[PDB]
């Protein structure tokens, strides 16, 4: 997007993630697995929602409309009756075409942004325990089982427990 | 016999959308007639699958 997570340093998206929009994949000692992140999913959907509702509270409840099809060739008044509609309809298209195209480029860049957000929530958890591989991947430098990384997923990770280990794996 | 706020000469349409392309004549709380017949809004992220 403008943030270059989605279709950026995040090589490509995940078709095997059916319970969520953004989420986690680990490999470790015990095995390997995947979970969705529910807040950042809900985050994104909750905007795209309101956005939609906003795009739609309009439908021209006005008001004695005028004749627009014709039985005769009449000249002057008829001409203006057509110019007036032909014009309106041109504008109201432009209006529509602009609307989707803005709405859409935003709707895209916004969800890209959320994937950044999750990524910065996670780096800041792993203060000096991890490093950014560069492809939306963290190398932790400490032994971390399926209960450990569950902490990370649910935001309950303490970084000082593991610090001493991780540091020594990294710098030594 | 049915319920529908918007009537055109072609016949009743739904005003759940914002924009109709059916007929430029209306009567009722009718979407705004436009030239296009399809304008799609994103309801999701950019889709980037494998090969």
């Amino acid at each position: 997007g403008l943030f270059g997570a989605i279709a950026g340093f995040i090589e490509n998206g995940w078709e095997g993630m059916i319970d969520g929009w953004y989420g986690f994949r680990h490999q470790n000692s015990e095995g390997t697995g995947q979970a969705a992140d529910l807040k950042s999913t809900q985050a994104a959907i909750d905007q795209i929602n309101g956005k939609l509702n906003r795009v739609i509270e309009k439908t021209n409840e006005k008001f004695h409309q005028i004749e627009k099809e014709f039985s005769e060739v009449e000249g002057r008044i008829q001409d203006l009756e057509k110019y007036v509609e032909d014009t309106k309809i041109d504008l109201w298209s432009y209006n529509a075409e602009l609307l989707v195209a803005l709405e859409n480029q935003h709707t895209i860049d916004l969800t890209d942004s959320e994937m950044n957000k999750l990524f910065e929530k996670t780096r800041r958890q792993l203060r000096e325990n991890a490093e950014e591989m560069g492809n939306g991947c963290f190398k932790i430098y400490h032994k971390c089982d399926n209960a450990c990384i569950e902490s990370i997923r649910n935001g309950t990770y303490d970084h000082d427990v593991y610090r001493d280990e991780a540091l020594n794996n990294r710098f030594q | 016999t049915c319920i529908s706020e918007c009537i055109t000469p072609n016949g009743s349409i739904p005003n759940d959308k914002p924009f109709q392309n059916v007929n430029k004549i209306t009567y009722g709380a009718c979407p705004k007639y436009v030239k296009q017949n399809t304008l799609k809004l994103a309801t999701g992220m950019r889709n980037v699958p494998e090969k």
């Epitope: 807040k39 929602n49 939609l52 | -």
Partner: antibody, heavy 129, light 107 residues
Framework: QVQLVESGGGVVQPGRSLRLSCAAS????????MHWVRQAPGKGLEWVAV????????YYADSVKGRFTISRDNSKNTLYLQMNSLRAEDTAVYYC??????????????????????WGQGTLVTVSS | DIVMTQSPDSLAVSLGERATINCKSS??????????LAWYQQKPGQPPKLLIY???TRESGVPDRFSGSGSGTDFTLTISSLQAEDVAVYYC?????????FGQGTK
């Protein structure tokens, strides 16, 4: 303002069926996700299921999941529920509520619903022979 | 699933005096500055009408004296003083996650 007159519920014996109904006047019905909500008398109040305004998203509470089939029509502004193979602790009255949230996009099983705004008149059901 | 208390269980107050119920959940119910939590009244044999919503807002068109508060998981109703038209069943309920999870029944 809002009305939600229901229909079509009585007794039917075990392992059987009936389709319920729910009229809706006084609000643009085809833009609001819809529910079914039940109680067994005296004991705890319980959630059945839901059906997005879309008509293309439906989710259930495990106690009836795999037996039931919820749906809706939008030219005739009404909501049903299709019941197939009724079990023991089912005996209860049913109630069609209105979701508060506007065009809630129910993209997944678990997403935040909105609070139950208004409530239908009623319908009587008892799995009994 | 997710779990809702109403502790203590049943109310036993007199006519013209304050009081308080207490609703507690398992997972937190605050997200993006909004507290997803709504109650209800059920005059036995009438389908429920709406009391509080989103934590602390009044109902569609409810009595002046009720109040509601709390954040996170530790919510608290507060009726001003028990009136004549106040003799019904009650619950608390969340809508942060499907399935929306109900309570048991406050007389």
């Amino acid at each position: 303002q809002v009305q939600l007159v229901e229909s079509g519920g009585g007794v039917v014996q075990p392992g059987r069926s009936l389709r319920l109904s729910c009229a809706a006047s006084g609000f643009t019905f085809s833009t609001y996700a819809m529910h079914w909500v039940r109680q067994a008398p005296g004991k705890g109040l319980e959630w059945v299921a839901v059906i997005s305004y879309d008509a293309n998203y439906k989710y259930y509470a495990d106690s009836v999941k795999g037996r039931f089939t919820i749906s809706r029509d939008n030219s005739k502004n009404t909501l049903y529920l299709q019941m197939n193979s009724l079990r023991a602790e089912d005996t209860a009255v049913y109630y069609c509520a209105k979701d508060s949230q506007l065009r809630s996009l129910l993209y997944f099983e678990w997403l935040s619903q909105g609070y139950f705004d208004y409530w239908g008149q009623g319908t009587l059901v008892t799995v009994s022979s | 699933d997710i779990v809702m208390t109403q502790s203590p269980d049943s109310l036993a107050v007199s006519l013209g005096e304050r009081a308080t119920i207490n609703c507690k959940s398992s997972q937190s119910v605050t997200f993006n500055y909004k507290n997803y939590l709504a109650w209800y009244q059920q005059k036995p044999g009438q389908p429920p009408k709406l009391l509080i919503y989103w934590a602390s807002t009044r109902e569609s068109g409810v009595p002046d004296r009720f109040s509601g508060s709390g954040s996170g998981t530790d919510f608290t109703l507060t009726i001003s003083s028990l009136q004549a038209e106040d003799v019904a069943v009650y619950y608390c309920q969340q809508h942060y996650r499907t399935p929306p999870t109900f309570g048991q029944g406050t007389k």
